[PDB]
Amino acid sequence: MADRAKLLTTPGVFGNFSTYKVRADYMKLPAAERKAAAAEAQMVIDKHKDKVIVDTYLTRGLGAGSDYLLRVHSTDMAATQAFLVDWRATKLGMYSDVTENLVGITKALNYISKDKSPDLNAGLSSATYSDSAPRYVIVIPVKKDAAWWNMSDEQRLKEIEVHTQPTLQYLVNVKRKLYHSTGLADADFITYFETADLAAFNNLLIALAKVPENTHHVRWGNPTVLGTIQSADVLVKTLSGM
Template structure:
């Protein structure tokens, strides 16, 4: 065979092999990858976008935790903060202090991510830390954020405008409240228009409280035993009590088979401060 011809064949063969390898290694960037890169755990975006998973996990210290020396407990706190830092590009972690506000728990996590598996990885690694080995998991709730389903600009423009314009004007929130909700089969068998009527009454009863109470809804049907996780922040617990009383008195409440059980109330201090308070 001509030497130049053989050399050309070899070069073509090598080029083809390189192309195949590059095709295997260079995985196409998906729309989900682009979305993840765009949000990149930007707090304001993560907490306002649909399609974000929210996981709530509630913990109670095991008795042997308080038998450890204080210096050792404080060292373990720094390990948890390092873990939160390690995963900051994939999960957004908030920690709330519940000790003293209820007998069941001492603290809870609220974790957001575009991928539920990322939350699972963080929680698995947390359980491997010294603090994770000294707590009991009391409850876990899983949900995902979605766009408004009932009160939309097309269906109820005036109510939608009122909802969209309602802004929080209170002090920096001191308290967080988590309430899981499950609806009855009767609710899900209502027509959409019937449910829309109920949700219109629900929304009207809440509008007057939005200046003093922040709220966020997570959809849980099929992901958890609940159908919804309702999360609130406020510094005015009297207004919050009035809001819940108002919601309890509307017809929609007849379709609840679970409303709380438990209701989790905690203070908002920031992850490091909460963990340090608990370690003292």
């Protein structure tokens, strides 16, 4: 059976990110049909609970790319697909147009490992989030240029150490997670963040804009997906006028 804490903290897990706009004729449906949408959403999540985990987020009003985001994990990529196929059959899903959908895999540390960069690795492992419960999500797709990948392992390691040094301080108020996507999407990475403090988040990304690694980005957003963390019930009720 699928265990949430394990799926969120181990290598080899597929993360499937999808954003949707609600079609204009959804709100033209009868109120009873929309009232029932929330229970249909919970049933489809529950149907797939032995294979996948699902998180929901409200993006309407915080960007033009979408109205909501789904983050789905499984050790089986096709299982994420099957969940999303069934989601699209729900009442809300049927009235949802997909606007972005990126997949990636979690991996062991390539750079800031105990073996390769022990001091920074220690700071990474010892950090503790100490703020209020996160309220916001940010997803940033990232793609690096050919020049980056053609640099040596040693050159890249140095640039990732420079990425890490000024950002460790933000682990008190930003949670991060990295997925790897080269060959599976038009991105090298999907980056995922949770925070209560968007002022801090803006400062964190400014810090990263200022390092030489940033000279290699050909995608660093587009979209930058900003949303609020919501339960599935609240999300679907909100989008259904319920």
